[PDB]
UniProtKB/Swiss-Prot annotation:
Native source species: Schizosaccharomyces pombe (strain 972 / ATCC 24843) (Fission yeast)
Modified residues (Phosphoserine): 78
A biological process term (GO) from this entry: cytoplasmic translation
Cellular localisation: Cytoplasm
Protein's recorded name: Translationally-controlled tumor protein homolog
UniProt gene name: p23fy
MF terms (GO), sorted A to Z: calcium ion binding; guanyl nucleotide exchange factor inhibitor activity
Matching Gene3D superfamilies: Metal Binding Protein, Guanine Nucleotide Exchange Factor, Chain A
Any one Gene Ontology cellular component term annotated for this protein: nucleus
Length: 168
């Protein structure tokens, strides 16, 4: 029920309606489940000439999708290996300033903890993928999608430093 949004440019990055766990480091984890819904194509809010919506006569088009991405229309975008270093570097520094203006005591704990997680993320930045909200900003809240140690549990992480809690 809790709603967490970013102030830099995340806009509703995740919520507790699913489940959130903060790792000893400084990030939250919102688990997502798969649900089957009847979708008949969308392609943005308008962008098609003429169609029939028939395809076959033995299946309409049921597609399972995460409940967090569907409710928050999460939008995953492609990225570059070297481009990732520039986004995490200029983004980490951006937060460093937000602490100095708000809480300067979070500058050191945030640097050491965030530095450790970044080192374990580069080991497989591809397996963590890179998501982005409708804001379309490579310097806003960045969420990564990774499967637990099992693989049957899809979960994403949201930097707690750039995540606030909102009560209904």
């Amino acid at each position: 029920m809790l709603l967490y949004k970013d102030v830099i440019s995340g806009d509703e990055l995740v919520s507790d309606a699913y489940d959130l766990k903060e790792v000893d480091d400084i990030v939250y984890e919102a688990d997502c489940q798969m649900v089957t819904v009847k979708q008949g194509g969308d392609v943005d809010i308008g962008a098609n000439p003429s169609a029939e919506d028939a395809e076959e006569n033995a299946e309409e088009g049921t597609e399972t999708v995460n409940n967090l991405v569907y409710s928050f229309r999460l939008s995953p975008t492609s990225f570059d290996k070297k481009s990732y270093m520039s986004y995490i570097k200029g983004y980490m520094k951006a937060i460093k300033a937000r602490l100095q203006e708000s809480n300067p005591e979070r500058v050191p704990v945030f640097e050491k903890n965030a530095i450790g997680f970044v080192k374990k993320i580069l080991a497989n930045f591809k397996d963590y993928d890179f998501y982005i909200g409708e804001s379309m900003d490579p310097d806003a809240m960045v969420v990564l999608m990774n499967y637990r140690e099992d693989g049957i549990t899809p979960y994403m992480i949201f930097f707690k430093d750039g995540l606030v809690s909102e009560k209904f």
